[PDB]
C-alpha cells in the first residue's frame, strides 16, 4: 500500500509500505528520505504513538493512512 | 518603527512586514469572560493597532473561574469596563477602549472581529455583514471540557506564507540541460513537488541566475527537476538555489452556508468521528439558550440534557446532517454546558489569538473552518459526578466545580506543587493554577523557583510582569502578581532564586520533595529538563513537561509507575559547524557569525580572564601547563594584555583596533591563500576551492567604509572597556590617528598548520611582572549580552561577520539577523505559551484524579502556523520479569534501612529470592560473593553506610538522607538477572 507522513513543519512524505511491515522498518524508510535517526522519530497514528517491535497492522494502519511525525521543543 | 527591544522574540516568528500590518489593524472582541479576556491578553501583547471590548453583562461570581482580571468586589459592574483598565496596562503601544452599543455599521472600523459568548442567531447577523464587507470574523466558545473555533476571512482571503518556515536554500553541484539539478555533497534539499525556486551563482547557465521561479519535480532526496533548460546552456555547475514561497487565496464560506457543509479541522485523528457530533451539539446549545432566556443547561442536570438532546434531533434533520447522534457524548456537552475551565480558555485563547494575527497579516495558514476540540479524558472518575456535586456554591470556582465537582475541588486546593521556571510558560502556568485554586486549601502550597531577572523583551510573553518590574526576580515578582489575581494564595506561595540542578540539591533536598504532589517544568533548556526528570523518577513524583518554538509547542506527562520518563526518549543535539569550516572554509553567513562570536570572546573575554586569574591564583602558572590546552595562548594573553599592548588612551586603542583588522581580515587570509593557492588542485586534480570552499580574498583597509569603520569603532571601544578608558564617538578622532598609521609589512611564513618550544614558551613567562607588583589590580572582562546596544557587543560581531563575509564573497546580514544567530535566540511568543499551558493543566487534573489507565493521558504536539494539533497516549515504562514478578525498569526500587551487609544479603535471599553476587555504590565495589573469606568476614557485620565510607576512604556528607546502590544477583534458578536499584534510607 501507500501511506502519508505529515510533519510538524507542514511537510508531507509518501511511503510505499505493507501492512505487515515493522515500525522499525518504517522509521528507516523515513530516515532514507529525511535523514532522521529512527531513535528521534515520533510517529503518531490515530492518537497512538508507534513503538518498535510492533507492525503497521498491529496499529490497524491500512491503505492511504496518514501519520504524524512530531518532535519535542526545548523552548520555554 | 518597530520596538525591537520588546517585540524582539516575537519578531523572529512574525517578521517586521508582518507586524507593520498589525500596528494598523483594529480588533474587536465580543465577550469578556475567561475566553474573551485570554484572547485580548494575547492580541494586546501582540501589537495590533488597538483593542476594543464589548460586554455589558455584570460580573457573576462564577466568572472568576477563568477571568483573571475580575476581583471579588467587581461583581455587578460590566466585565467590559472592569477589565479594559488592566488590559490597557499590558502593552503600552496598544490602546484599549470599550463600547456600549452594537452597531452593524460600526464593525467596518475593525480588521478582525472576535465573537465569544454569543447566540448563533446573533452570530449570523454579525457574520452576514462582516463577510459581505470583507471583514475577518472569528467565533469561539469554551464549554467545560469542550471548545470550538470558527474562522471566516472573506471569500477572497490571500495568504502569503502557508507554513511559516524559512525559505529553503542549498548549494548545488550540477544541473543538466534537462532540468536535473543535483545537490551538493550528500546535501538534502528538502523540497516538495510543486515548490518554486530561483537560482544564483550558477556558471554554465547565466540566464538561470535571473530570479524567475521554477516548479520543482523531486526525483529523490538529493535531486530534483525544474524542466528542460537547454536553451540557457548545456550544463550548469555549482550554484545556490532558494525556495520562493508562492501565496495562495483561501475561500471562506459564510457562517450561514458553511453551517450547512462544515469544513472540519480535526485536532485529533483518534476522535475522528466527534467533530460532526459537536457541530450539532454546539448549535443545540444555542437553541436551548433562547428557549430558557439565554441560560445554559444546569451542571450535570438530566432533565435539561434530555431536552437538549431533542434540540439536537431538531437541527439534525433541518440541517439534513445524515449522522448517527451519539446520545451519551452529546449529553455530556449539556452537563458540562456551564463549565468554564481556565485551561480550556488558555488553550482556545492562544489558539484564537493566533488566528486574529493571521487575519491581519496574511501570514500562516488559517483554520478552515471548524475547530471542535474536547479533552473529555480529563473528566474525573475517582469522585462522584452528579447533579448534586456539581451544583454552584457561590464561590469563584463554580465554573470549575460545574465540571469536576466540589468534592474534587478539594483535592486541587490541597495540592503541593513545584514550578521550575518563571518565564513565558511559568507565568501562564501560575495564572492557570490561581484560577483553578491550586494550593488554596490547607495542606496546599506552591513553590516557584528561577534564577533570572525580568528584562524588557520578557514583557512580551510574560504578562505577570510589567516594565516597572524590570530588574526584579521573576519567581518573586510573579508570586506577588498571582496573590492579586486570587488572594486566597497569599502566604501559600514560596519563591526561590535557586537554579535547579546539582548545586541547588541543598535546598530542594529529600525532605523538600517528599512533600511535593507533583512537579511542572517551565524551562528553556534540555539539560535542566533532564535533571528534573531524573529527580522526579528518583522521588517517584509526577512531572508535567512542555515546550515551545515559535508557533510550535509540545506537552508531555510522566506519571510514576505508569509512563516512561522525559529522558527515556531521545532528541537531536545542537547543530554545531565543523571546527575547520568556521576556522578556514566558511560558505554561509552563519559560519562567519559563529566565527565573529569566537573572535569577540577571544579578544575581550578569554584573555582578560587569564589576566585576573594570574592576579588571584598563586600556582595558576604551573597548573596551567598541567591542564590548559594551549599554555602558549595563556602566557601570551597576559604578556600582551598587561604590558606588551596595555593601552593608555582611546587613541592608543584605535591603533590596536586597526592592527586587528589586518590580523583577521588580511594577513590571516593571505597566509591561507599561501598554503592553498587560489587555483591549486587536489589529488583528484580538482580545484581545491570548489563547491564547499569559497576562495577568499584579503581585504585592504578603508577608513571610509561602513563595515571597516564599524569594526574599528566597536573593536576599539571594547578594548577600552577592558582597561576602562573613555570611548569616543566623534569620527574625526579616528581619522586623526588612523590616517597616520603605518602597518608593519606581512609576509606569509612557510610551515604553518592549517587543517582541512619547551624553552621559548617557558621563557616568556619570565618577561612578565610578578603579581606582587600589581596587587589589587584587575581588568574588566566583557560578558556577551545580546539584549543591549550601549555595549557595542552585537555591533562588533555584525561588522566582524560582514567583514569576513566580504573575504569569502558571502552575502552579509543586518545586525537583526546577526543578533538572532550570534545570540542563539529562541523565537517565541505568547500564543504558543498559552496553548501549552492549557494542555498542561488539562493533564494536571488527570494526575489529581489518580487515573491509572495510560490510554487516558495525552502528550501534545502542535504548530499554530498551520493549525496542526495532534495528541498521543504516553509510552509505557519498559517492564521486566524477575522471578516471574513484573518490575518497572524505571520506577521500581528496593527500599531498605541502614542495615548490615549480612542483613541486606539475607533480605534479598529470603524476601526477594535473589542471591546478591555483587553490591556497589558508584564506581566502588562493596561486596561480591567471589571475594576472599577475609574481606567478607570483616565487612558482613558492618552497616551499609559504614561500608561505603570505608571502601570509599571518604566519609559521607551529613546533608544526605538517602544512598543509592546497584546489585548483581541470581534468580531462583541461579541465573544472573537484572534487578532494580536500592535506596538505603539512612
Ligand atoms: N536550570 C534552571 N533552573 C531554574 N530555572 C531555569 C533553569 N534554566 C532556565 N530557567 C528559567 O526558565 C525561565 C523560562 O524560560 P524563558 O525562555 O521563558 O525565559 P528567558 O530565558 O528569560 O527568555 P529569553 O531567552 O528570551 O531571554 C527563565 O526565566 C529561565 O531563567
Ligand atoms: Ca518544504
Ligand atoms: Ca604600548
Ligand atoms: Ca510494581
Ligand atoms: Ca524480586
Ligand atoms: Mg533572560
Ligand atoms: Mg530562554
Q: Which residues of B are annotated as a binding site?
A: 9, 424, 450, 452, 455, 458, 461, 474, 500, 524-525
Give the three-class secondary structure for B891: coil
Question: In B825-914, at which residue ranges do the beta strands (DSSP E only) sit?
Answer: 859-863, 868-872, 881-882, 885-886, 894-896
Give the closest of B163, B870, B875 to A70, CB-based. B870
Q: How does DSSP classify residue B162?
A: S
| Strand order from edge to edge, sheet including A42-45 | A12-16, A2-7, A66-70, A42-45, A48-49
Provide, as residue numbers in chain A, all residues whose Cβ is less than 8 Å from the Cβ of B522: 76
Cell of B107: 464593525
Annotated binding-site positions of B for ATP: 9, 424, 450, 458, 461, 474, 500, 524-525
Q: Can you say whether the dihedral through the CA atoms of B122, B126, B132, B135 is positive or negative?
A: negative
Phi and psi angles of residue B660, each rounded to the nearest 5 degrees, phi first? -55, -45
Classify the C-alpha dihedral B345-B348-B353-B354 as positive or negative: positive
Domain(s) of CATH 3.40.50.720: residues in chain B: 411-569+826-892
Topology of domain B1-114, CATH: FAD/NAD(P)-binding domain (3.50.50)
Please, which residues bridge with residue B876 across strands?
B563
Is residue B559 within 8 Å of B551, Cβ to Cβ?
Answer: no
CB atoms within 10 A of CB B827: 19
State the catalytic residues of B.
Answer: 580
* Chain centroid offset of residue B102 CA: 40
Method of determination is X-ray
Which among B651, B661, B670 has a CA at the least distance from the CA of B599?
Answer: B661
B520 CA → ligand 4 middle, Å:
24
Angle subtended by helix axes B34-46 and B79-87, to nearest 10: 30
Where chain B is discontinuous (C–N > 2.5 Å), the residues before each break are 756
**With helix as H, strand as E and coil as C, how does B88-127 read?**
CCCCCCCCEEECCCCCCHHHHHCCEEEEECCCHHHHHHHH
After which residues are there C–N gaps above 2.5 Å in chain A?
none
Q: Which of B423, B479, B504 to mutate to test the pocket of ligand 1 (most atoms within 8 A of CB)?
A: B423
What domain range includes position A55?
A: 1-76
Sign of the dihedral defined by the CA atoms of residues B362, B364, B365, B371, in that order: negative
Looking at beta carbons, which residues of chain A come within 8 Å of B547? 72-76
Question: Ligand 1: does its nearest atom lie under 6 Å from the Cβ of B458?
Answer: yes
Whether the Cβ atoms of residue B167 and residue B245 lie closer than 8 Å to each other: yes
C-beta separation of A48 from A76 below 8 A = no
Residue B462, all three cell numbers: 510574560
Phi and psi based region of residue B505 (left: phi greater than 0; alpha: psi -120 to 50; beta: remaining): alpha
**Stretch (H or E) spanning B520:** strand B518-521
**Helix pair angle (B424-436, B342-359), 10° resolution:** 140
Task: Indicate yes or no: CB of B554 within 8 angstroms of CB of A10.
Answer: no
What does chain A come to in residues? 76
Q: Specify the 3-state DSSP secondary structure of B817.
A: helix
- Residue A16 class from Cβ within 10 Å (0-12 exposed, 13-18 middle, 19+ buried)? exposed
At B50, which helix (H) or strand (E)? strand B50-54
∠ CA B755-B761-B765, nearest 5°, is 135
Contact status, residue B964 vs residue B981, Cβ threshold 8 Å: yes
Overall fold of domain B166-244 = Elongation Factor Tu (Ef-tu); domain 3 (2.40.30)
Burial class (CB in 10 A: 0-12, 13-18, 19+), B825: middle
CA distances from B449 to B22, B476, B529, B547, B943 (A): 35, 8, 14, 18, 37
CB contact under 8 A, B875 and A35: no
Distance CA B326, CA B376 (A): 14
CATH 3.10.290.60 is held by the domain B893-986: yes
Which architecture, in CATH terms, is B570-825?
A: Orthogonal Bundle (1.10)
Contacts of B420 in chain A (CB under 8 A): none
- Specify the CATH architecture of the domain B411-569+826-892: 3-Layer(aba) Sandwich (3.40)
Distances (CA, A) of B967 to B781, B908, B929, B951: 49, 10, 12, 16
| Rounded CA separation B189/B186 (Å) | 10
**B712 vs B723: CA distance, rounded Å:** 17
Residue B13 CB–ligand 1 contact under 6 Å: no
Q: Which helix (H) or strand (E) holds B310?
A: helix B302-318
Ligand 1, atom 21, residue with closest C-alpha: B524
Residue pair B280/B319 in contact (Cβ under 8 Å)? The answer is yes
Distance B426 CA to ligand 1 centre (A): 9
Topology at the third CATH level for domain B115-165+245-410: Rossmann fold (3.40.50)
Nearest to A72 among B268, B424, B547 (CB): B547
Distance from C-alpha of B821 to C-alpha of B787, rounded to nearest angstrom: 13
Q: How far is the CA of B452 from the centre of ligand 1 (A)?
A: 7
Quick one: which atom of ligand 1 is closest to the CA of B461? 18
CA distances from A14 to A17, B182, B191, B266, B847 (A): 10, 21, 13, 21, 38
How many Cα neighbours within 13 Å face the side chain of B687? 10
DSSP H or E run through B602: helix B589-604
Size of interface A-B (CB pairs under 8 A): 108
From residue B574, how far is each of A30, B570, B571, B925, B980 by CA, in Å? 21, 13, 10, 36, 33
- Say how many Å lie between the CA of residue A24 and the centre of ligand 4: 29
B826 touches chain A (CB under 8 A): yes
Q: DSSP string spanning B248-296? A: EEEPPPPHHHHTTS--B--S-TTSTTSHHHHHHHHHHHHHHHHHTTT--
In eight-state DSSP terms, residue B4 is T
d(CA B462, CA B215): 43
Q: Give the C-alpha separation, B519 to B362, whole Å.
A: 39
Tell me how many domains chain A contains. 1
Cell numbers for B186, please give them: 550528500
**Number of CB atoms found within 10 A of residue B374's CB:** 24
Residue B305 Cα distances to B148, B323, B405, angstroms: 20, 19, 18
Q: How would you classify residue B273: left for phi > 0, otherwise alpha for psi between -120 and 50, otherwise beta? A: alpha
Using an 8 Å CB-CB cutoff, list chain B residues near A71.
Answer: 554, 571-572, 861
Positive or negative: CA dihedral B716, B722, B723, B726: positive
The C-alpha atoms of residue B903 and residue B905 are separated, in whole angstroms, by: 5
| CA–CA separation, A52 and A31 (whole Å) | 15
Alpha-carbon distance of B898 to B965, in angstroms, equals 12
Q: Record the cell numbers describing residue B77, joined without a space.
A: 459592574
Q: First vs last Cα of chain A: how many Å apart?
A: 40
Q: Is A29 helix (H, G, I), strand (E, B) or coil?
A: helix
Report the distance separating Cα B588 and Cα B968, nearest Å: 53
Q: Rounded to whole angstroms, how far apart are CA atoms B645 and B779?
A: 14
Interhelix angle B650-665/B793-807, rounded to 10 degrees, is 30
* Contacts made by residues B476-479, CB under 8 angstroms, sequence distance 24+: B478/B422, B478/B426, B478/B427, B478/B430, B478/B448, B479/B430, B479/B448
Which DSSP state fits B642? Answer: I
* Beta-ladder partners of A4: A14, A66
CATH label of the domain that carries residue A64:
3.10.20.90
CA distance A39 to chain B (A): 6
3-state secondary structure of B490: coil
Q: Where do you find CATH 3.40.50.12550 in chain B?
A: 115-165+245-410
Residue with cell 521486566: B880
Q: How many residues does chain B have?
A: 986
Amino acid at each position: 500500500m501507500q501511506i502519508f507522513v505529515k510533519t510538524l513543519t507542514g511537510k508531507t512524505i509518501t511511503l510505499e509500505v505493507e501492512s505487515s511491515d515493522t515500525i522499525d522498518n518504517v522509521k528507516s524508510k523515513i530516515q532514507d528520505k529525511e535523514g532522521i535517526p529512527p531513535d528521534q522519530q515520533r510517529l503518531i497514528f490515530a492518537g497512538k504513538q508507534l513503538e518498535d517491535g510492533r507492525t503497521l497492522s498491529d496499529y490497524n494502519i491500512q491503505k492511504e493512512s496518514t501519520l504524524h511525525l512530531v518532535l519535542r521543543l526545548r523552548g520555554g | 518603527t518597530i520596538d525591537e527591544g520588546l517585540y524582539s522574540r516575537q519578531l523572529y516568528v512574525l517578521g517586521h512586514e508582518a507586524m507593520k500590518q498589525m500596528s494598523q489593524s483594529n480588533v474587536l472582541i465580543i465577550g469578556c469572560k475567561g475566553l474573551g479576556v485570554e484572547i485580548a491578553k494575547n492580541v494586546c501583547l501582540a501589537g495590533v493597532k488597538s483593542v476594543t471590548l464589548y460586554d455589558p453583562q455584570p460580573t457573576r461570581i462564577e466568572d472568576l473561574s477563568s477571568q483573571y482580571f475580575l476581583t471579588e468586589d467587581d461583581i455587578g459592574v460590566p466585565r467590559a469596563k472592569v477589565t479594559v483598565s488592566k488590559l490597557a496596562e499590558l502593552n503600552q503601544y496598544v490602546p484599549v477602549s470599550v463600547v456600549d452599543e452594537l452597531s452593524t455599521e460600526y464593525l467596518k472600523n475593525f480588521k478582525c472581529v472576535v465573537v465569544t459568548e454569543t447566540s448563533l442567531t446573533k452570530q449570523l447577523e454579525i457574520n452576514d455583514f462582516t463577510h459581505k464587507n470583507h471583514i475577518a470574523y472569528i467565533a469561539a466558545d469554551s464549554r467545560g471540557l469542550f471548545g470550538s473555533i470558527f474562522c471566516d476571512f472573506g471569500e477572497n482571503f490571500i495568504c502569503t506564507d502557508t507554513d511559516g518556515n524559512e525559505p529553503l536554500t542549498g548549494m548545488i553541484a550540477s544541473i543538466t540541460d534537462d532540468g536535473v539539478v543535483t545537490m551538493l555533497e550528500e546535501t538534502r534539499h528538502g523540497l516538495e513537488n510543486g515548490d518554486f525556486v530561483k537560482f544564483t551563482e550558477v556558471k554554465g547557465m547565466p540566464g538561470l541566475n535571473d530570479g524567475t521561479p521554477r516548479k520543482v519535480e523531486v526525483k529523490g532526496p538529493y535531486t530534483f527537476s525544474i524542466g528542460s533548460v537547454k536553451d540557457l546552456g548545456s550544463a550548469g555547475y555549482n550554484g545556490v538555489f532558494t525556495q520562493v514561497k508562492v501565496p495562495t487565496k483561501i475561500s471562506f464560506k459564510s457562517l450561514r452556508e458553511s453551517l450547512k457543509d462544515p469544513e472540519y479541522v480535526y485536532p485529533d485523528f483518534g476522535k475522528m468521528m466527534r467533530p460532526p457530533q459537536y457541530h450539532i451539539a454546539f448549535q443545540a446549545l444555542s437553541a436551548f439558550a433562547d428557549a430558557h432566556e439565554g441560560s445554559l443547561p444546569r451542571p450535570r442536570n438530566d432533565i435539561d440534557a434530555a431536552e437538549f438532546f431533542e434540540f439536537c434531533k431538531k437541527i439534525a434533520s433541518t440541517l439534513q446532517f445524515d449522522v448517527e447522534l451519539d446520545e451519551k457524548l452529546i449529553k455530556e456537552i449539556s452537563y458540562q454546558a456551564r463549565g468554564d475551565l481556565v485551561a480550556m480558555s488558555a488553550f482556545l485563547g492562544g489558539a484564537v489569538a493566533q488566528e486574529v494575527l493571521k487575519a491581519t497579516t496574511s501570514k500562516f495558514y488559517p483554520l478552515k473552518q471548524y475547530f471542535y476540540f474536547d479533552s473529555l479524558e480529563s473528566l474525573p472518575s475517582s469522585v462522584t459526578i452528579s447533579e448534586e456535586t456539581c451544583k454552584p456554591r457561590g464561590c469563584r470556582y463554580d465554573g470549575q466545580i460545574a465540571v469536576f465537582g466540589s468534592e474534587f475541588q478539594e483535592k486541587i486546593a490541597s495540592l503541593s506543587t513545584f514550578l521550575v521556571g518563571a518565564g513565558a510558560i511559568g507565568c501562564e502556568m501560575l495564572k492557570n493554577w490561581a484560577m483553578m485554586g491550586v494550593a488554596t486549601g490547607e495542606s496546599g502550597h506552591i513553590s516557584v523557583t528561577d534564577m533570572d531577572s525580568i528584562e524588557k523583551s520578557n514583557l512580551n510573553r510574560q504578562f505577570l510582569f510589567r516594565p516597572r518590574d524590570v530588574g526584579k526576580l521573576k519567581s518573586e515578582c510573579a508570586s506577588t502578581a498571582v496573590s492579586i489575581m486570587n488572594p486566597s494564595l497569599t502566604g501559600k506561595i514560596t519563591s526561590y532564586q535557586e537554579r535547579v540542578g546539582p548545586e541547588s540539591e541543598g535546598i530542594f533536598g529529600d525532605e523538600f520533595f517528599e512533600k511535593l504532589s507533583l512537579v511542572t517544568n517551565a524551562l528553556d533548556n534540555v539539560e535542566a529538563r533532564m535533571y528534573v526528570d531524573r529527580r522526579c523518577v528518583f522521588f517517584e513524583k509526577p512531572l508535567l513537561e512542555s515546550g515551545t518554538l515559535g508557533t510550535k509547542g509540545n506537552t508531555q506527562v510522566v506519571v510514576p509507575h505508569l509512563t516512561e520518563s522525559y529522558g527515556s526518549s531521545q532528541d537531536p543535539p545542537e547543530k554545531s559547524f565543523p571546527i575547520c569550516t568556521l576556522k578556514n572554509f566558511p560558505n554561509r553567513i552563519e559560519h562567519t557569525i559563529a566565527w565573529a562570536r569566537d573572535l569577540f570572546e577571544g579578544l575581550f573575554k578569554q584573555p582578560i580572564d587569564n589576566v585576573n586569574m594570574y592576579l588571584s591564583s598563586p600556582n595558576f602558572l604551573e597548573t596551567s601547563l598541567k591542564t590548559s590546552s594551549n599554555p602558549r595562548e595563556v602566557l601570551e594573553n597576559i604578556r600582551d594584555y598587561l604590558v606588551t599592548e596595555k593601552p593608555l588612551s582611546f587613541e592608543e586603542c584605535i591603533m590596536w583596533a586597526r592592527l586587528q583588522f589586518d590580523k583577521f581580515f588580511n594577513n590571516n587570509i593571505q597566509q591561507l591563500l599561501f598554503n592553498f593557492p587560489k587555483d591549486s588542485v587536489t589529488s583528484t586534480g580538482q580545484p581545491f576551492w570548489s563547491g564547499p570552499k569559497r576562495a577568499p580574498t584579503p581585504l585592504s583597509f578603508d577608513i571610509h567604509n561602513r563595515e571597516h569603520f564599524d569594526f574599528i569603532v566597536a573593536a576599539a571601544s571594547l578594548y577600552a572597556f577592558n582597561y576602562g578608558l573613555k570611548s569616543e564617538t566623534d569620527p574625526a578622532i579616528y581619522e586623526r590617528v588612523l590616517a597616520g598609521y603605518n602597518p608593519p609589512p606581512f609576509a606569509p611564513k612557510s610551515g604553518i598548520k592549517i587543517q582541512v618550544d619547551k624553552q621559548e614558551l617557558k621563557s616568556i613567562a619570565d618577561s612578565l611582572p610578578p603579581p606582587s607588583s600589581l596587587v589589587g589590580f584587575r581588568l574588566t572582562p566583557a560578558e556577551f549580552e545580546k539584549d543591549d546596544d550601549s555595549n557595542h557587543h552585537i555591533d562588533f560581531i555584525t561588522a566582524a561577520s560582514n567583514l569576513r563575509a566580504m573575504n569569502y564573497d558571502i552575502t552579509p546580514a543586518d545586525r537583526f539577523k546577526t543578533k538572532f544567530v550570534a545570540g542563539k535566540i529562541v523565537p517565541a511568543m505568547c500564543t504558543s505559551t498559552a496553548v501549552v499551558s492549557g494542555l498542561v493543566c488539562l493533564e494536571l487534573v488527570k494526575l489529581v484524579d489518580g487515573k491509572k489507565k495510560i490510554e487516558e493521558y495525552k502528550n501534545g504536539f502542535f504548530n499554530l502556523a498551520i493549525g496542526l494539533f495532534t495528541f498521543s497516549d504516553p509510552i509505557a515504562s519498559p517492564k521486566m520479569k524477575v522471578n516471574g514478578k513484573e518490575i518497572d525498569k524505571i520506577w521500581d526500587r528496593y527500599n531498605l534501612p541502614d542495615c548490615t551487609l549480612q542483613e541486606l544479603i539475607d533480605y534479598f535471599q529470603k524476601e526477594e529470592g535473589l542471591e546478591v553476587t555483587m553490591l556497589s555504590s558508584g564506581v566502588s565495589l562493596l561486596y561480591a560473593n567471589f571475594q576472599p573469606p577475609k574481606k567478607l568476614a570483616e565487612r558482613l557485620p558492618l552497616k551499609i553506610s559504614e561500608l561505603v565510607e570505608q571502601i570509599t576512604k571518604k566519609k559521607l556528607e551529613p546533608f544526605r538522607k538517602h544512598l543509592v546502590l546497584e546489585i548483581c544477583c541470581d534468580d531462583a534458578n541461579g541465573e544472573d538477572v537484572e534487578v532494580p536499584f536500592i535506596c538505603i534510607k539512612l
